[PDB]
Design an enzyme around this catalytic site. Sequence first.
Site, PDB file in Angstrom:
ATOM      1  CB  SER A  31     -54.711 -80.379  46.294  1.00  0.00           C
ATOM      2  OG  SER A  31     -55.674 -81.055  47.085  1.00  0.00           O
ATOM      3  CE  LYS A  70     -54.523 -76.344  45.979  1.00  0.00           C
ATOM      4  NZ  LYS A  70     -53.800 -76.996  47.121  1.00  0.00           N
ATOM      5  CB  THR A  71     -49.725 -77.846  48.844  1.00  0.00           C
ATOM      6  OG1 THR A  71     -51.044 -77.505  49.298  1.00  0.00           O
ATOM      7  CG2 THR A  71     -48.728 -76.838  49.381  1.00  0.00           C
ATOM      8  N   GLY A  72     -50.092 -80.227  47.004  1.00  0.00           N
ATOM      9  CA  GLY A  72     -50.890 -81.430  46.892  1.00  0.00           C
ATOM     10  C   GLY A  72     -50.477 -82.444  47.931  1.00  0.00           C
TER      11      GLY A  72
END
Length: 268
Positions: A49, A213-215
């Site tokens: 993501s 922003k994480t993934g």
Amino acid sequence: GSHMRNVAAEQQLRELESTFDGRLGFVALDTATGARIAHRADERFPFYSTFKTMLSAAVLARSAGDAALLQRRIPYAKRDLVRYSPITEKHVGAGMTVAELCAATLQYSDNTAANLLIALLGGPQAVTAYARSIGDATFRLDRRETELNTAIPGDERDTTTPAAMAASVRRLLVGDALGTAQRAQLNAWMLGNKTGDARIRAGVPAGWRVADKTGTGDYGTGNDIGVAYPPDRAPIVFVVYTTMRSRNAQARDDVIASAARIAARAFV
């Protein structure tokens, strides 16, 4: 800071990588000096993501030339929902505005919101083209959610490198890639992220503000990218990619937080 402290940080990152099965891909950039702490900086990793930052930047760039784009409403139906759509599932039918979709994809990592924005731009290749326009020759978006999470060994689809993503995050959130107002909106959205409290945020001192922003792909995988804003010193870019498949979420989050903590120590 100093080169000696940065070299010690890189040794600490190698030691951190030895504590889990898998690879750590890390870049931190101190914008006060341009100093970089790096580990596997030029190896490709699945971005998961974290690409939603590049996607939202591309939408914002278009909005600079179309004053109504962010208010445009995009309808969609139940059959359009993919897994992990906590916001868009609430608004089936009339749908959501482009701005609302950006906020949902950035702050809750909403997958259907990302797919709708990809379609708005003309397909995944429009995100790759946007990356090229800001100087990123490495990023490539090939698929939509959730197929882009497959993370097949050796597959370069839907990957970037820690170095390229750090350079892009710097240009987008701190530098000249976007216009003033759009850079600010991207920062505002990422500062309000709700999914990253245990990742980069957990590794930096209290009083630092973080735009991240994480993934996360399959169970136990993950990463995080962003910029930390210390209260009285220059911003620091953090990019933490991994290939681990951990036993549980906290084990993976601890690695990401520890990597950030190592670089924060070197730069304070």
